[PDB]
Amino acid sequence: ARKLVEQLKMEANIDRIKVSKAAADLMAYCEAHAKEDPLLTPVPASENPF
């Protein structure tokens, strides 16, 4: 069980950011790329192949 405990110790020693910060970063990324998404904002007659 040496490998399991070593892996657990390695995983424990890691810097974790706040969950709120991660959610804010995800929201900011979505807002930045919100217009660039084809599915989220349908393009008018710009579907060249589809």
Partner 1 sequence: ELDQLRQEAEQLKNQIRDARKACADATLSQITNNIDPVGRIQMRTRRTLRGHLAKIYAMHWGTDSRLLVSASQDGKLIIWDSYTTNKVHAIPLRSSWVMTCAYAPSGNYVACGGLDNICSIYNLKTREGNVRVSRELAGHTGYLSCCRFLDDNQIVTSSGDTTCALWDIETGQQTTTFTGHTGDVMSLSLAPDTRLFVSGACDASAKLWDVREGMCRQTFTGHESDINAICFFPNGNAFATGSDDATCRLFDLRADQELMTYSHDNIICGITSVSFSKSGRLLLAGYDDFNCNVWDALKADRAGVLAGHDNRVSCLGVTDDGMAVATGSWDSFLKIWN
Q: Is 45 near partner 1 (CB under 8 A)?
A: no
Q: Is 39 near partner 1 (CB under 8 A)?
A: yes
DSSP string, 15-28: ----HHHHHHHHHH
Cα–Cα dist 29/23, whole Å: 10
Q: Considering beta carbons, is residue 44 or 47 the nearer one to partner 1?
A: 47
Within a 13 Å sphere around the CA of 40, how many CA atoms are in the beta-carbon half? 8
Q: Is 28 near partner 1 (CB under 8 A)?
A: no
Binding residues for partner 1, rule CB under 8 A, total: 29
Q: Is 44 near partner 1 (CB under 8 A)?
A: no
